[PDB]
RNA sequence: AUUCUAUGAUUAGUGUGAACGAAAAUAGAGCAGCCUAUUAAAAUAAGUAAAAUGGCUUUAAAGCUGUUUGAAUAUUGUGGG
RNA sequence: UAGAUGUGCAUAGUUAAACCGAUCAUUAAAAUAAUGAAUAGUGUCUAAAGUUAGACCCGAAGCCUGGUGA
RNA sequence: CUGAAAAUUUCCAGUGUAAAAGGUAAUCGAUAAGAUAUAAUUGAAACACCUUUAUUUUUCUAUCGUAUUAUUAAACCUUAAAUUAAGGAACAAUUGUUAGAAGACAGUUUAUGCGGGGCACAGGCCCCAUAAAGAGUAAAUGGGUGUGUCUAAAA
RNA sequence: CAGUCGCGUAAGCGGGGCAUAGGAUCACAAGAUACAAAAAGGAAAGAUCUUGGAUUUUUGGAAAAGCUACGCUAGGGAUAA
């Protein structure tokens, strides 16, 4: 009946395991927008760009 | 001697805010009998902003117009869907007979007149071209007063509302007295969003966050607004009237 | 301008829901119309106070009935009000056409529909009181009673005006005393300083 | 999902999606003419209407 | 505000026995400064310390601890 | 421990706890076998 | 103080970055670089 | 249970370094359990446990401690580790 | 009579490390694509040695603690 | 800037001590008259009234901080076998914590190189010669205004 | 060699600059890796990879002022009169 591995208990998982799916979904979400983001960058220009990360 | 770089921000824990419908119930009573065309609401939104920062000087084109400087009257078939659609757009008058008899009296409550593609014939039969000529209100395609689409033109002849931040507040009208809660509601959401959109568009150094939203009339008291919309009293329900 | 400043100035002006002229009108009524002059002359002061004192208290408890006013410049105009009491046993007629308020008499008293019977009430050189009671007894309506919290609202703001008027005169006595003292000295030094 | 497969969703390797001109220069010329034709023909009808 | 503050003593629980004015009536339980109880009341037999044993004999519990009434006057 | 249980709970190692698994269940105590299809 | 070291962050949200120097009185850097996590060339933008 | 010797151990670990340095367990020497203690003691433990702060010890735990504060009632899961 | 018992080293390598394993590690997926690493130990004696102890021997000025003396 | 009530905001002109903006064409006057305001004038900006904010100044409340007073009315302290005495007094004093602070006192450092040492000066890196036709090669040897940089490429 | 981008008809070139003048560890900070996780589930603190801030200029990297003619010890004549 110990924490996690006992009868009825459920393992919690490490932080990098609980956030694994949300981690890969964020990278997938970004690549899908990569083409449209490069077009805006190659169109607006390297100098007039202002949408920088934070 | 002392100085601060901020605008005084009071504590709202004890404030008494009102819902939009509950508030209009208090205001509509103080404006009993007042000309609805000369009585308009107003909103003062206090912002937690620094004195040194910049100011807002953008414009907003509300769904329904509030300024009564350009009163537009349309001529559509009586009872048609355009009649009610015209009122939902900001039309002061929409009809053939009601307008024909109104202009024949000698007093025109409006300053501009339009004619839809469906009421072209009946116009000349009313025998009124001799009336609108001198006043220059003769609806003609030369003035682009005849159109099949209405909302497409109502956005140019009327204009766009202007708002400016003077000192930690922004003051501008939001609707006339005759505005129904449904029309007045969206008329406010368009104003708050355009602001919050311009704030985020601004720099991130000092994001100006809203603190309170007030609502009053030209002769009414300044009351606080709650995000809610429906009345707290279960007996009352959304009711529209003069 | 604190939140409590604006709060006390509001809750005092919220006497609309009070005893003087508030009452729950019956569903039999349909709409109201009134017409009077701008100024107070030739018996026209009565309706004005009825419009600024008791009439607003009806729309709060009766926000569904339209109460319109039609002002005019003709001081001799008939200060009379019509009450569309009859709704044809609540038959719900289609009374779509109805005017709106104005200031030049542009919205006179329209003719009632078939299922409507108006009730005329004259008022000229008569006090609002006699005009008010004539409205309730004729238009049978139950008068709403205030709650204990409303009695505290009247009692609180009443005691407040005591402290206010006590201060209105006090601060007035310090400014004039200064405006007076600042003058006595001006007549002494600033008078000879001109040379 | 492997990170390399997540990168090959936009397209096959060898090119950078978003860098290749989507429209053909010849097509832009054909469109530039049609717009001009309608403008010239537009004045024709408006002149004939007058 | 802070997550840690200076630790202070609220007082000692006592039960009056002489109906002291300005503090409370007879048999009144409340917390009072330790100085007054240790130097003024206890020597004159005006009150008594409310120990966990004293609660049991009197049948009371910790819920009976009241407050000082500065308005009390015999 | 989690690791020790998962080791003897999978049939790849012929663990003496593998009989506790279902034919479609995973040995991990946290991870699960995702489902394939259009949904 | 005339020169600063900036960090160009991958817009693929992989967490990879490049570091380059550029004068303070210059516009932020933005380049198309190779990301070894996704193994493709993506857009890299300056951190701040 | 305690005590003594050896191994564990130039180990875990600490430390910028130089160095410092356990325990479990094992083997041997001895072996003894009790409160009615083979000498005469408990009505089962509250300013205590514990916390903040200043120190000692130390691996950050545990243990010792000045100052200021300050709990609970037993596996029917109360308290310490 | 029988059973058990008593340090350790080696017997498999590889990596920062585990999983893994005659294969392992890096290659953000993997794959003879590339590079590195695989086969007798253990005990004793004799002798020479590294380390820690006075550490091949002799030799300070001085520092600290406790006592002695007008 | 804890909050309430009330009030105050003067460059010239301007009917006059214009706080600012947004909105208004009406508001006030118990029934008879007129005062405000809008207009017109002045000015960059024009006023009642309803609102929402800004500056400054009084009282009140709240919070801090000082200042004084009382205390056998048994804190504590002093004289005093030590008291219903006298005086001081919520200070002082002591404990803990915190900050400043005397070489008064303690420990240690203050180097090394150098045609003796002291003073001074020097300490990494780059190019040329010295260098004797591979490379290397010293001296408080000689050359040098050498050097701890610059550089995202475009309008 | 693998990965994937640029220029070029093509062959091919490209892992900064015609060449020769910018210091580590530790600690700290920002990203990634999924390694281990002191009963167990987590975490903390660690490990690996990338990266950043140094007259650490006595620049293989101490936080550091003098007098002694009142001077002392060990040595050198390996450097003086
Ligand atoms: K613990
Ligand atoms: K091994
Ligand atoms: Mg105290
Ligand atoms: Mg170690
Ligand atoms: Mg016990
Ligand atoms: Mg303790
Ligand atoms: Mg501890
Ligand atoms: Mg303990
Ligand atoms: Mg005294
Ligand atoms: Mg000294
Ligand atoms: Mg040579
Ligand atoms: Mg040679
Ligand atoms: Mg654990
Ligand atoms: Mg060196
Ligand atoms: Mg070197
Ligand atoms: Mg001498």
Swiss-Prot record, chain B:
Keywords: Mitochondrion, Ribonucleoprotein, Ribosomal protein, Transit peptide
GO molecular function: structural constituent of ribosome
Coiled coil segments of this chain: none
The keyword Ribonucleoprotein appears for this protein: yes
Localization (cell): Mitochondrion
Transmembrane segments: none
Main subcellular location of this protein, as a coarse class: mitochondrion
GO CC field: mitochondrial large ribosomal subunit
Domain of life, per lineage: Eukaryota
Record's function text: Component of the mitochondrial ribosome (mitoribosome), a dedicated translation machinery responsible for the synthesis of mitochondrial genome-encoded proteins, including at least some of the essential transmembrane subunits of the mitochondrial respiratory chain. The mitoribosomes are attached to the mitochondrial inner membrane and translation products are cotranslationally integrated into the membrane.
Oligomer status and interactors: Component of the mitochondrial large ribosomal subunit (mt-LSU). Mature N.crassa 74S mitochondrial ribosomes consist of a small (37S) and a large (54S) subunit. The 37S small subunit contains a 16S ribosomal RNA (16S mt-rRNA) and 32 different proteins. The 54S large subunit contains a 23S rRNA (23S mt-rRNA) and 42 different proteins.
Family: Belongs to the universal ribosomal protein uL1 family.
Protein name, per record: Large ribosomal subunit protein uL1m
Organism of derivation: Neurospora crassa (strain ATCC 24698 / 74-OR23-1A / CBS 708.71 / DSM 1257 / FGSC 987)
Part of the whole protein covered: 59 to 300 of 303
UniProtKB/Swiss-Prot annotation, chain C:
Compositional bias of kind Polar residues: 93-105
An MF annotation (GO) of this entry: structural constituent of ribosome
Keyword Ribonucleoprotein found: yes
GO cellular component: mitochondrion; ribonucleoprotein complex; ribosome
Mitochondrion recorded as keyword: yes
Coiled-coil regions listed: none
Alphabetic keyword roster: Mitochondrion, Ribonucleoprotein, Ribosomal protein
InterPro entries membership: Ribosomal_mL43/mS25/NADH_DH, Ribosomal_mS25/mL61, Thioredoxin-like_sf
SMART domains (UniProt xref): L51_S25_CI-B8 (SM00916)
Pfam families: L51_S25_CI-B8
Region listing for Disordered, in residue ranges: 86-117
Location of this chain's protein in the cell: Mitochondrion
Function: Component of the mitochondrial ribosome (mitoribosome), a dedicated translation machinery responsible for the synthesis of mitochondrial genome-encoded proteins, including at least some of the essential transmembrane subunits of the mitochondrial respiratory chain. The mitoribosomes are attached to the mitochondrial inner membrane and translation products are cotranslationally integrated into the membrane.
The protein's assembly and partners: Component of the mitochondrial large ribosomal subunit (mt-LSU). Mature N.crassa 74S mitochondrial ribosomes consist of a small (37S) and a large (54S) subunit. The 37S small subunit contains a 16S ribosomal RNA (16S mt-rRNA) and 32 different proteins. The 54S large subunit contains a 23S rRNA (23S mt-rRNA) and 42 different proteins.
Entry similarity comment: Belongs to the mitochondrion-specific ribosomal protein mL61 family.
Protein name: Large ribosomal subunit protein mL61
Organism: Neurospora crassa (strain ATCC 24698 / 74-OR23-1A / CBS 708.71 / DSM 1257 / FGSC 987)
Gene designation per UniProt: mrp49
Curated annotation (Swiss-Prot), chain D:
Source superkingdom: Eukaryota
Location of the protein in the cell: Mitochondrion
UniProt family annotation: Belongs to the bacterial ribosomal protein bL27 family.
Role noted for this protein: Component of the mitochondrial ribosome (mitoribosome), a dedicated translation machinery responsible for the synthesis of mitochondrial genome-encoded proteins, including at least some of the essential transmembrane subunits of the mitochondrial respiratory chain. The mitoribosomes are attached to the mitochondrial inner membrane and translation products are cotranslationally integrated into the membrane.
Description of how the protein assembles with itself and partners: Component of the mitochondrial large ribosomal subunit (mt-LSU). Mature N.crassa 74S mitochondrial ribosomes consist of a small (37S) and a large (54S) subunit. The 37S small subunit contains a 16S ribosomal RNA (16S mt-rRNA) and 32 different proteins. The 54S large subunit contains a 23S rRNA (23S mt-rRNA) and 42 different proteins.
This protein's name: Large ribosomal subunit protein bL27m
UniProt source species: Neurospora crassa (strain ATCC 24698 / 74-OR23-1A / CBS 708.71 / DSM 1257 / FGSC 987)
UniProt gene name: mrp7
Residues of the full protein shown: 299 to 348 of 447
UniProtKB/Swiss-Prot annotation, chain E:
Transmembrane segments: none
Localization annotation: Mitochondrion
Quaternary state and interactors: Component of the mitochondrial large ribosomal subunit (mt-LSU). Mature N.crassa 74S mitochondrial ribosomes consist of a small (37S) and a large (54S) subunit. The 37S small subunit contains a 16S ribosomal RNA (16S mt-rRNA) and 32 different proteins. The 54S large subunit contains a 23S rRNA (23S mt-rRNA) and 42 different proteins.
UniProt similarity note: Belongs to the bacterial ribosomal protein bL9 family.
Function: Component of the mitochondrial ribosome (mitoribosome), a dedicated translation machinery responsible for the synthesis of mitochondrial genome-encoded proteins, including at least some of the essential transmembrane subunits of the mitochondrial respiratory chain. The mitoribosomes are attached to the mitochondrial inner membrane and translation products are cotranslationally integrated into the membrane.
Protein name: Large ribosomal subunit protein bL9m
Organism: Neurospora crassa (strain ATCC 24698 / 74-OR23-1A / CBS 708.71 / DSM 1257 / FGSC 987)
């Amino acid at each position: 009946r110990v924490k996690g591995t006992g009868v009825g208990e459920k393992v919690k998982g490490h932080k990098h395991e609980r956030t694994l799916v949300a981690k890969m979904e964020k990278r997938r979400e970004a690549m899908l927008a990569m083409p449209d983001l490069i077009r805006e960058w190659k169109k607006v220009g390297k100098r007039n760009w202002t949408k920088f990360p934070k | 001697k002392k100085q601060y770089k901020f605008f005084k921000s009071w504590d709202l824990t004890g404030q008494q805010q009102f819902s939009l419908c509950d508030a209009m119930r208090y205001l509509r009573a103080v404006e009993v009998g007042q000309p609805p065309l000369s009585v308009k609401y107003e909103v003062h939104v206090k912002l937690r902003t620094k004195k040194n920062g910049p100011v807002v000087r953008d414009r907003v084109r509300l769904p329904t117009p509030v300024k009564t400087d350009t009163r537009i009257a349309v001529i559509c078939p009586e009872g048609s869907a355009l009649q009610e659609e015209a009122k939902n757009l900001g039309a002061v008058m929409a009809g053939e007979e009601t307008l024909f008899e109104a202009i024949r009296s000698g007093n025109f409550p409006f300053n501009k007149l339009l004619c839809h593609t469906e009421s072209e014939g009946a116009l000349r039969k009313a025998n009124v071209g001799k009336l609108l000529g001198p006043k220059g209100l003769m609806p003609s395609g030369k003035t682009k007063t005849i159109t099949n689409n209405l909302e497409a033109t109502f956005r140019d002849m009327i204009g766009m509302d202007e708002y400016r931040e003077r000192n930690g507040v922004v003051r501008m009208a939001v609707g006339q007295l005759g505005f129904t809660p449904k029309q007045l509601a969206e008329n406010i959401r368009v104003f708050m969003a355009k602001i919050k959109s311009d704030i985020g568009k601004l720099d991130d150094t000092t994001p100006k966050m809203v603190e309170e939203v007030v609502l009053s009339t030209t002769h009414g008291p300044g009351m606080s607004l709650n995000a809610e919309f429906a009345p707290t009293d279960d007996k009352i329900k959304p009711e529209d009237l003069e | 301008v604190g939140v409590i400043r604006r709060l006390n100035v509001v809750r005092e002006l919220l006497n609309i829901r009070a005893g003087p002229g508030a009452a729950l009108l019956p569903k039999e009524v349909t709409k109201v119309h009134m017409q009077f002059a701008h100024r107070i002359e030739e018996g026209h002061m009565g309706p004005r106070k009825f419009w600024r004192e008791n009439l607003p208290k009806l729309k709060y408890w009766n926000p569904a009935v339209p109460m319109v006013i039609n002002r005019t410049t003709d001081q001799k105009g008939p200060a009379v009000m019509t009450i569309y009491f009859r709704d044809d046993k609540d038959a719900k007629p289609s009374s779509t056409p109805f005017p709106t308020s104005s200031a030049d008499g542009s919205s006179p008293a329209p003719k009632p529909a078939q299922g409507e019977r108006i009730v005329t009430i004259d008022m000229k050189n008569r006090n609002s009181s006699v005009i008010l009671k004539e409205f309730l007894d004729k238009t049978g309506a139950v008068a709403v009673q205030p709650t204990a919290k409303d009695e505290e609202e009247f009692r609180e703001f009443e005691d407040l005006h005591r402290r206010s008027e006590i201060d209105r005169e006090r601060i007035r006595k310090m400014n004039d005393a200064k405006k007076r003292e600042k003058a006595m000295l001006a007549k002494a030094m600033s008078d000879a300083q001109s040379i | 999902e492997t990170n390399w497969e997540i990168g090959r969703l936009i397209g096959d390797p060898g090119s950078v999606p978003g860098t290749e001109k989507v429209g053909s220069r010849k097509a832009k010329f054909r469109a530039r003419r049609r717009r001009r034709n309608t403008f010239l023909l537009g004045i024709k009808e408006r002149k004939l209407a007058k | 505000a802070s997550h840690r503050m200076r630790l202070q003593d609220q007082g000692v629980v006592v039960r009056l026995l002489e109906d002291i004015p300005k503090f409370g009536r007879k048999h009144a339980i409340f917390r009072i400064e330790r100085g007054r109880m240790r130097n003024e009341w206890f020597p004159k037999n005006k009150a008594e310390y409310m120990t966990p044993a004293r609660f049991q004999e009197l049948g009371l519990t910790r819920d009976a601890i009241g407050e000082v009434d500065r308005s009390f006057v015999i | 421990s989690r690791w020790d249980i998962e080791y003897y709970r999978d049939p790849a190692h012929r663990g003496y706890l593998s009989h506790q698994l279902a034919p479609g269940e995973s040995p991990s105590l946290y991870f699960k076998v995702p489902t394939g299809g259009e949904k | 103080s005339r020169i600063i070291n900036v960090r160009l962050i991958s817009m693929a949200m992989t967490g990879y970055f490049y570091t380059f120097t550029r004068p303070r009185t210059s516009l932020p850097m933005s380049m198309l670089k190779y990301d070894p996590i996704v193994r493709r060339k993506v857009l890299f933008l300056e951190q701040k």
